[PDB]
């Protein structure tokens, strides 16, 4: 019973913390986007229309 709980807690953290520090890092390295009107004669990128940089990256990837 303890070993299984130890296995989950240790291993689920194995990817937990690197993503957790990653989410904070992007929030404290490049920051969040801010509102801006549509510039003249510029087509906005499909992924550019989103606030969170990870969200923008997710839009740049598969979607």
């Amino acid at each position: 019973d303890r070993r299984f709980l130890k296995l989950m807690r240790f291993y689920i953290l194995l990817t937990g913390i690197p993503v957790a520090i990653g989410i904070t890092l992007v929030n404290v390295f490049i920051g969040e986007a801010e509102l801006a009107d549509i510039p003249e004669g510029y087509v906005p990128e499909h992924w550019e229309y989103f606030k969170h940089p990870i969200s923008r990256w997710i839009a740049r990837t598969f979607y």
Binding site: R2, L5, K6, R9
Partner: protein
């Protein structure tokens, strides 16, 4: 930017840290109970400050935060509303449970799963603090169900005991029927007023809440254990003594009346529902007290005293005095928690025996526990200028000074006179008199944890009302000019309540025989409610479930209507279409029939 914004949430988030550490298992498997006690004690210290700017500044705020989900025109989001009721109820809840946590490491100094017990208490604790701090009805439903299920585990803590599960089942049962009114009030507000935030419901002037308020009343009735939906609370004793000391004193059963306090501004508009509160409140006081004074168990008497108080509590709502109801909530916390505090101390010391017939003589033997019991019992009656008189006596004076429904006024009066009766029964068969317990006496109370826990509650239950009543901003017009007899009646009714009770109690001291009384037979059997309404309806519903519902309908007819009839129809005729005798004479004769009939009457020829 005031601390009233961030701190009032900090005193909520810090309640969750001990829960998380248990998952990490870094939680101190040696001194976890002290970890919980100190954390709750700390949160009480944090819970102090929001009170101060409530008295000084008088500010009331509402917190809206992370948006769960946006539902068309319903923005269901996490929300915390710091109202006078919420901000006042936080410190008293933590202070009471911090004292209870102090008691637990004394009473539970031997339970092997003690760490699990403290884990449940915090989970219960955090569950109510969001129940009392809610702004949207759905989050108010978050804690409402959470406290019930948490109470289920806590009552069934001694899960080996069969009757503990049955009482645990009873608690979740009556809660569910009470819950039906909550979900009914849930849909009505969403359909008509188109929200669950308390701001919109009050804003949209739902002055015809006839059905929602009836559901709201039903929700309170199940949780606060009023007549009809109550015997779970008297039977919620299989759980350990600290459990009933925390949950079923003023920190689980109170939830029902506190719900009505939240919805007070629209409750006063309707008159039928509030009158029904006088009906339910008045009868609850008596039938609990009537079945209380004839109980030979200290824990049963104490729990019955609670249900009478909340029975008295909803009476205060019915006269459009909801703030005074909340005053009664805080004051009742200090008394009844110590009442269960005292019982837990004597029970454990006297070889975990609760039958009130086996105490006596502990007055000189147990001075401190005796002093606290005198403190609590006298507060319960309403000793002037004590924490009891600051709420109960004011309530009775306000009760008669209104358009009270005649019988409700009389019913509370006799109940409050009956309030002292079981209190005397406690002090009489307990310390006062000649002892009756087994010979080996191990009466010990000198444990520092037990002494400090009771003393902490003791000091509170003398100056609690003074501090609260003086510091609270006046939110209710008082009544100043009373005819003397009914302004004094609250004091006097307990004076006879003392007077006859001691007379009939010392009547047992008389050497002559005591005849069995049929009224006593009715009273001592909890008014026959469990013996009737718990084995008659359960049998009928469950016997219907198997004999007819699960047997006659499911696999006696439903499997017979469609499946077996079709199978039998195919069965019967497949015999008839597969039992040819192989005679070519019969075969070709049938050919003659078909060729004759086909060329004929069916008009295939044209």
């Amino acid at each position: 930017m005031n601390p009233f914004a961030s701190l009032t949430l900090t005193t909520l988030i810090i309640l969750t840290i001990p829960i998380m550490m248990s998952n990490s298992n870094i939680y101190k498997t040696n001194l976890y109970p002290n970890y919980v006690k100190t954390t709750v004690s700390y949160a009480f210290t944090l819970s102090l400050v929001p009170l101060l700017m409530f008295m000084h500044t008088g500010q009331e705020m509402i917190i809206s935060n992370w948006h769960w989900m946006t539902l068309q025109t319903v923005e269901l989001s996490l929300s915390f509303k710091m109202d006078y009721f919420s901000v006042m109820f936080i410190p008293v809840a933590l202070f009471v449970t911090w004292s209870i946590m102090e008691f637990s490491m004394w009473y539970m100094h031997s339970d092997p799963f003690i760490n699990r017990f403290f884990k449940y208490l915090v989970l219960f604790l955090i569950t109510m603090m969001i129940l009392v701090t809610a702004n949207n009805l759905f989050q108010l439903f978050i804690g409402w169900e959470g406290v019930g299920i948490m109470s289920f585990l806590l009552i069934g803590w001694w899960h080996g005991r069969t009757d503990a599960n049955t009482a645990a089942l009873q608690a979740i049962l009556y809660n569910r029927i009470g819950d039906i009114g909550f979900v009914l009030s849930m849909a009505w507000f969403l359909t008509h007023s188109n929200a669950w935030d308390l701001q919109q419901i009050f804003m949209l002037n739902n002055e015809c809440p006839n059905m929602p308020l009836i559901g709201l009343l039903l929700a309170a009735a199940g949780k606060s254990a009023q007549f009809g939906l109550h015997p779970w609370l008297p039977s919620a004793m299989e759980g350990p003594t600290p459990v009933s000391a925390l949950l079923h004193s003023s920190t689980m059963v109170v939830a029902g009346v506190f719900l009505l306090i939240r919805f007070y501004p629209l409750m006063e508009t309707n008159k039928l529902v509030q009158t029904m509160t006088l009906c339910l409140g008045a009868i609850t006081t008596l039938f609990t007290a009537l079945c209380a004074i004839t109980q030979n168990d200290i824990k049963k008497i104490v729990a019955f005293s609670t249900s009478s108080q909340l029975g008295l509590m909803m009476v205060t709502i019915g006269i459009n005095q909801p703030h005074l109801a909340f005053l009664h909530i805080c004051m009742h916390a200090f008394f009844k928690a110590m009442l269960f505090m005292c019982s837990g101390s004597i029970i454990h010391s006297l070889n975990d025996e609760q039958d009130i017939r086996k105490m006596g003589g502990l007055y000189k033997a147990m001075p401190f526990t005796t002093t606290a019991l005198i403190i609590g019992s006298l507060a319960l009656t309403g000793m002037p200028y004590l924490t009891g008189f600051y709420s109960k006596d004011l309530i009775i004076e306000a009760v008669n000074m209104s358009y009270t429904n005649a019988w409700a006024l009389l019913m509370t009066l006799i109940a409050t006179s009956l309030t002292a009766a079981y209190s005397t029964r406690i002090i009489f068969f307990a310390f006062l008199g000649k002892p009756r317990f087994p010979p080996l006496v191990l009466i010990n109370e000198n444990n520092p944890l037990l002494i400090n826990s009771i003393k902490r509650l003791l000091i509170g239950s003398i100056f609690a009302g003074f501090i609260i009543s003086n510091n609270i901003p006046p939110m209710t017009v008082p009544n100043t000019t009373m005819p003397l007899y009914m302004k004094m009646t609250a004091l006097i009714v307990t004076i006879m309540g003392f007077m006859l009770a001691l007379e009939l109690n010392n009547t047992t001291y008389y050497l002559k025989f005591k005849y069995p009384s049929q009224t006593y037979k009715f009273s001592n059997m909890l008014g026959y409610y469990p013996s009737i309404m718990h084995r008659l309806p359960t049998y009928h519903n469950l016997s219907m479930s198997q004999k007819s519902a699960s047997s006659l309908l499911d696999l006696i007819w439903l499997e017979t209507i469609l499946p077996k009839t079709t199978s039998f129809i195919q069965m019967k005729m497949s015999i008839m279409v597969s039992n040819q005798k192989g005679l070519i004479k019969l075969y070709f004769l049938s050919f003659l029939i078909t060729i004759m009939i086909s060329m004929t009457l069916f008009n295939y020829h044209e």
